[PDB]
Amino acid sequence: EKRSKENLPWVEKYRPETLDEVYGQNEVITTVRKFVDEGKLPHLLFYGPPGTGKTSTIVALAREIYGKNYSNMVLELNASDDRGIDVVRNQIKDFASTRQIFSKGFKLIILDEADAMTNAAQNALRRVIERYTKNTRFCVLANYAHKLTPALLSRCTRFRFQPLPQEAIERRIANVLVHEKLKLSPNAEKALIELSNGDMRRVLNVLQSCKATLDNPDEDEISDDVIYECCGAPRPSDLKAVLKSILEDDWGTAHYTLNKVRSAKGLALIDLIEGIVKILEDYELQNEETRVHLLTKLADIEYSISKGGNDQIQGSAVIGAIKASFENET
Amino acid sequence: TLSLQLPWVEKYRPQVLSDIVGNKETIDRLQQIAKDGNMPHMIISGMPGIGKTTSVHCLAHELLGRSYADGVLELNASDDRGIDVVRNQIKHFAQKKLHLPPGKHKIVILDEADSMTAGAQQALRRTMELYSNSTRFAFACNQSNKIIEPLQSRCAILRYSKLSDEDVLKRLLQIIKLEDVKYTNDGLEAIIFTAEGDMRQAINNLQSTVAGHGLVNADNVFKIVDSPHPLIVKKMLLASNLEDSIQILRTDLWKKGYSSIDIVTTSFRVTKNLAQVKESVRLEMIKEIGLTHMRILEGVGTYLQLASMLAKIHKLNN
C-alpha cells in the first residue's frame, strides 16, 4: 500500500485480522477455532454469498496458524491467477509434496473462488488432495455450488456462511462509529441495515459516502435523509404514497402522483418496483390469481428495464399491472 | 498446533478386501480372484465415495504382496496420461520382465480413466491384448460411457451400487467403537440421511461432529451439516399453495444464502427427476424454469424472478 491505512477504502480498512473480529458467523468460527486449537483441521469448503466473511475468515485462520509470516507459508490462488490443469499438475503438486522453507509445519493451500476453475483442473485436484492429506490441507471458497464437481465436494467439509444477521451489522457499525468520530440515528441505522441485504461491503461503503456527505462530520449526525440522499433510494413514505395512489385513485391521478414523486428526488423506477414488491409481499390477498399476476407482470417489467427501454411506458405498465392484478380481489 | 492429525477417512481407509462394505457380490468376487489369482482386465464404475479406489488398491496389495512396489503402475488425473505416455511408459511397463509367483501378474491402475482422451484409449488396446500373459489392467471411473467400447469389450464390468443405509450404519458404528465416540441413534440417523450414500461425506461429518460438539445427536449434527437443498427444492416445487412455495423459497433457500443460479439449477434437476408428476406437466415446468434460468444468466438474479417462476409453475399445476 501507500501512506497509511487511513488512505484505504473502509471496506478494506476494516478487514478483520483475527477470528475475533469476524461477526455473524459464530458457529463456523467456533468450529474452525476448535479444529485449529486441537490440530484436527480438515479440508474446508466455505460456501456463501458476497461479502459474508469467507476470505477474511480463511486469511485470519491462516494468520492464527502461522502468525505474521503466514503469507510465506501458504499457497493462495484465486480467479486472477492461472489455475489450469498444468498449474494443478506442477505448482500445486510440488507445493503439497514438499516441506516448508521458512519454518517447520504443514502446508495450507487456499483455492479462493474455486467456482471459476475448469472441470479438468478440479478432476486433477482429487488425487492431489487425497494423496498428500498427511502434510497438506485444502481450503476452497465458493459462491456457487453448482460450479464445483461432485468429486471435489465429496472431499471437503462444508461450512455455509449465512447472510449477516442484523445484530452483527449493528455491532460492526458501532465499532466503526467508535473509530470514525460519527453520530448515527436509529432510523438511519434501520435504513442502512434494510438496504444492506446482509452485505457488510454495502454497509461500509454507504457509511463512508454518508460521512463524506456531511458538512461538519465532527458535529453532524447522519440521518435517514442523508442515507436516502447519498444512495438516491426512495423513502418509505414515497413508496407508500405511490402504492396508495395506484390502488385508490384514478389513472390520471396515479400517473401524476408517480411522475411527481419520481421527479421530486430523481428516483429510478427499478427501486420503486423493488420497494412496492417488498410492501406487497406482506399483503394478505384473498385470491392467488392476484399474487400470480403481480409477480409475473412485475418480473416481466424488471427484465424489460434491465435491457433499457422507455421509462414512461414502463411506469405506466407498472401502474396498469398493479391495477389489473388488484381488480381480481373483487 | 502445527502438527496435523490424519482424518478418519484416510486413517480408517480399508486395507483389506474384507473391510469394505457394500456390493457384496462384487467384493466377494474380488476376494475369490485375490485368493485364486488370475485377475482379469476390469473396469469398476460408480458414483463418488463408494469404495472403488479402495477396492482396487486392496486387491492389488493382497495379490502382489511385497512385490507391490515393482508390479504396480498407478496413474490418475493428477498425472500426465497423454498418447505419448501410453505409447512409451505404459508399453515399457507392460513389456517389463518381473518374477512373480505362478498366479500373479503386473497391474496397471488407471484411476479416473474417464478423463483420458480417445487416442490414449485407442493406443491401450493392443498393449492390453499382446501382454495379458504378464500385465493386467484395472480402470476406475465415475462414468462408464467415457470409456470407449473397444476397451470395455476387453474388460470385466463391475458397476458398483450405492451403499445402503445399513452398510453406512455398520461402518460408522465400527469407526465409533474404534474411536470411542459418544453418540445417539438420532445423530447417526441424521448423519446417514445427510450422507446420501456417500461414505466419505458420512465419515467427514461424523468427525466434524465430536471434533466440534462432542456428542453426535441430531441437533448438533444439524448445527453444522445442512439438510440437502435438493430436498428443500423438491418440497418447494410440490407445495400445494403458492404461498407455501414462496414461504419455503424465502425462509429455507433465500435467507440461508443460497444463490439464485444454484436454486434454479436444482429446480431443473428435481423437476427432471419428479416421477410422481406427469411428463407433460414436468416439460412445461422445465420450460418455465429454463426461461427463469436464461433471465438469471443475463444478470437479473433477483428474488422476484424466482417468485415469478414459482407462480408460473403453480399456474401450470392447476
Binding site: - | D70, Q95, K96, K97, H99, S134
Partner: protein, 256 residues
C-alpha cells in the same frame, strides 16, 4: 552374481552398442561360458543384427550358467552415456535376473557409478544362422564402402550390387538419374588394407534398400575392412571383424 564381465574401458562396449543402435530397438543377449552372442531384428523384419564377443575381449569374464537378457537400446545408450570412456565397465547379473547392473569404476579418483537397467521380456527365439555357401565372397575397406554407399544414396533410394567376372558394380538407378561405381580386384603391398578381392562362384545381382545400407555402413568405425557375402537368392551378409568377435548384418534383398 553368476554373470560378471569386465571391460577394461567402457569405450569398447559403447562403440559396439552405437554400431547397431540406429537400426534396432530390442536386443537379446545370450551370455554363456564362451562369451556373449546378441541377436536383434528390426521393426520392418528386414534387417537382422548378430553380434559375437568372445572371452578375449574382457579382462575378467565369469558365467556360472547361461543367461538371457532382453535390452532396449534407448535405455542402454542413455545409461552408457553416464559413464566416462576411461573407466572400467562391469556388467553384472545374478540368478533369476530382473535387471542388469552396469558398474563404471575409476581408480584414479576412486569413483564408482552403479546403474541398474530393467530387462525386457522377449519371447522371440534365436533364429538359426546356419552356414550358407554364399556364391560371392567380396571384402573391401570400410571407408571405401561407406563413401560409395553415402554417395550413391543421395541419388536413389535403392542400390543394386552386381558381381561379375572382375567387376563389382553399385548402380543407383532412381529419381536422380542413374549413377554407378565400378571397382576391380586390386592388391597393394605398401598398404594392403586398401586391397579389394573377389572369390565368386557364380554371377550375382541383388537390389537393396538405401536406408538399410546407410544403417549398416555406420559400423565402419569398428573395423578397417568389411566382408560382403552374397548369394543368388538369399540375404546378404555384411561382416565387420573386431579385436575379439564380429558384428554381422543380414539384409533381405528387394524383389527382383
Amino acid at each position: 552374481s553368476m554373470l560378471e564381465a569386465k571391460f577394461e574401458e567402457a569405450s569398447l562396449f559403447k562403440r559396439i552398442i552405437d554400431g547397431f543402435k540406429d537400426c534396432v530397438q530390442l536386443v537379446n543377449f545370450q551370455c554363456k561360458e564362451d562369451g556373449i552372442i546378441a541377436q536383434a531384428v528390426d521393426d520392418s523384419r528386414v534387417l537382422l543384427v548378430s553380434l559375437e564377443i568372445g572371452v578375449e575381449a574382457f579382462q575378467e569374464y565369469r558365467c556360472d550358467h547361461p543367461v538371457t537378457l532382453g535390452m532396449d537400446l534407448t535405455s542402454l545408450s542413455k545409461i552408457l552415456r553416464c559413464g566416462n570412456n576411461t573407466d572400467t565397465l562391469t556388467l553384472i547379473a545374478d540368478n533369476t535376473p530382473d535387471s542388469i547392473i552396469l558398474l563404471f569404476e575409476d581408480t584414479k579418483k576412486d569413483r564408482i557409478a552403479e546403474y541398474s537397467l530393467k530387462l525386457m521380456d522377449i519371447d522371440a527365439d534365436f533364429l538359426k544362422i546356419e552356414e550358407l555357401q554364399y556364391d560371392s565372397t567380396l571384402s573391401l575397406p570400410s571407408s571405401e564402402f561407406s563413401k560409395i554407399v553415402r554417395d550413391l544414396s543421395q541419388l536413389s533410394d535403392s542400390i543394386n550390387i552386381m558381381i561379375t567376372k572382375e567387376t563389382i558394380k553399385f548402380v543407383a538407378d532412381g529419381d536422380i538419374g542413374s549413377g554407378s561405381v565400378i571397382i576391380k580386384p586390386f592388391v597393394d603391398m605398401e598398404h594392403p588394407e586398401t586391397s579389394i578381392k573377389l572369390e565368386m562362384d557364380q554371377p550375382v545381382d541383388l537390389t537393396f534398400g538405401a536406408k538399410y545400407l546407410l544403417d549398416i555402413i555406420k559400423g565402419s568405425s569398428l573395423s578397417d575392412r568389411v566382408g560382403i557375402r552374397l548369394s543368388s537368392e538369399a540375404p546378404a551378409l555384411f561382416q565387420f571383424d573386431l579385436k575379439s568377435g564380429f558384428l554381422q548384418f543380414f539384409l533381405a534383398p528387394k524383389f527382383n
